[PDB]
C-alpha cells in the first residue's frame, strides 16, 4: 500500500504546537480550543509556552479560544502528573485528560 | 506569545506516516530507515500499512530503506507487545524499541 505509519523513539512530551493570536494570553495547565485536521475542532491542554517551535512560525495553525483564565490543575497536581507521565512512560495527553475528570 | 507546546487526547498508537516509494514493500513488525527533522536519519518499526494518512499523501516524506525482509518480532510477541502497549498505556514506539534488545539478546 502507500502510507506506512511508523513509530520512532520520540522525545518525552510529544505535543502539538499552535500560535497564540495577538493579545491572547495563556499559561501552563489551561485548556484551549484548537484547529486540528482539515475540518476540525477539539479541546486541549497547554503544557508549556515557548518562543520556539520545531516548525516555521507561519505555517502553524492558531489557537481559537482559551477556556480557562487559571490552571484547572493545582501547581502540585500538575508537577505530579507531568512526573507520572515521564516516570511510568505514559503519553502526557493521556494522563492529563484521563486525569482531568477524576480531578473535577 | 507566539507558540506553545500542547498536549492532546491522542488516539491509541501515535505513529509517524511515511510514503512508500514505487516498488518498495514492507510488512508489520519490520524496521525501516526514515527521514526525520529538516535533515537527518533514524530507525523505526512499521506498525501498520494502510491506504490513507491524516495528511496529504504528497506532503509525507518517503521511506528510505527497509532493514528487514521479515518481522524481527514473532507473530505472538508482536500481538503481546501491541497489546501491552495499549492495555497499560505505553507509547507503542517505546515498548517496541525497548523490548527489542531483550527479546533478541
UniProtKB/Swiss-Prot annotation, chain A:
Q: What happens when the gene is disrupted?
A: Cells are filamentous and grow slowly with low viability, chromosomes can be fragmented, partitions nucleoids poorly, increased sensitivity to UV light and mitomycin C, does not allow phage phiX1874 replication. Loss of inducible stable DNA replication (iSDR, seen in SOS-induced cells), and constitutive stable DNA replication (cSDR, seen in rnhA mutants); neither type of DNA replication requires protein synthesis, DnaA or oriC. ColE1-type plasmids are not replicated. Defective in homologous recombination, hypersensitive to mitomycin C and gamma rays.
- Region annotation 3'BD: where it falls in the sequence: 1-99
From which domain of life does this come? Bacteria
| Induction of the gene | Induced by hydroxyurea.
The UniProt function text for this chain reads:
Initiates the restart of stalled replication forks, which reloads the DnaB replicative helicase on sites other than the origin of replication. Recognizes abandoned replication forks and remodels them to uncover a loading site for DnaB. Serves as the scaffold for primosome assembly. There are several restart pathways, the PriA-PriB pathway is the major replication restart pathway. The PriA-PriB pathway is subdivided into 2 distinct pathways. The PriA-PriC pathway is a minor restart pathway. Recognizes and binds the arrested nascent DNA chain at stalled replication forks.
> Domain notes, please?
Contains an N-terminal DNA-binding domain and a C-terminal helicase domain with a number of subdomains, all of which contact ss- or dsDNA. In a PriA-PriB-replication fork structure, movement of the PriA Cys-rich region (CRR) creates a pore through which the ss-lagging DNA passes, and exposes a surface to which PriB binds. The N-terminus (residues 1-181) recognizes the 3'-end of the leading strand in stalled replication forks.
Subunit structure, interactors included: Binds ssDNA as a monomer. Binds to replication forks, subsequently PriB then DnaT bind in a 'hand-off' mechanism, which allows DnaC to load helicase DnaB onto the fork. Forms a branched DNA-PriA-PriB complex when the lagging strand is single-stranded (ss)DNA. Component of the replication restart primosome, which is composed of PriA, PriB, PriC, DnaB and DnaT; DnaG primase associates transiently with this complex. There may be 2 PriA subunits per (pre)primosome. Interacts with single-stranded binding protein (SSB). Interacts with PriB; binding is improved in the presence of ssDNA.
UniProt record similarity statement: Belongs to the helicase family. PriA subfamily.
- Protein name per its UniProtKB record: Replication restart protein PriA
Full-length numbering of the shown residues? 1 to 104 of 732
Amino acid at each position: 500500500m502507500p502510507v506506512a505509519h511508523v513509530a520512532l523513539p520520540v522525545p518525552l512530551p510529544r505535543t502539538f504546537d499552535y500560535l497564540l493570536p495577538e493579545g491572547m494570553t495563556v499559561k501552563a495547565g489551561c485548556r484551549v480550543r484548537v484547529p486540528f485536521g482539515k475540518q476540525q475542532e477539539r479541546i486541549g491542554i497547554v503544557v508549556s509556552v515557548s518562543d520556539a517551535s520545531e516548525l516555521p512560525l507561519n505555517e502553524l495553525k492558531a489557537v481559537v479560544e482559551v477556556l480557562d483564565s487559571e490552571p484547572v490543575f493545582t501547581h502540585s497536581v500538575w508537577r505530579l502528573l507531568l512526573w507520572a507521565a515521564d516516570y511510568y512512560h505514559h503519553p502526557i495527553g493521556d494522563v492529563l485528560f484521563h486525569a482531568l475528570p477524576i480531578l473535577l
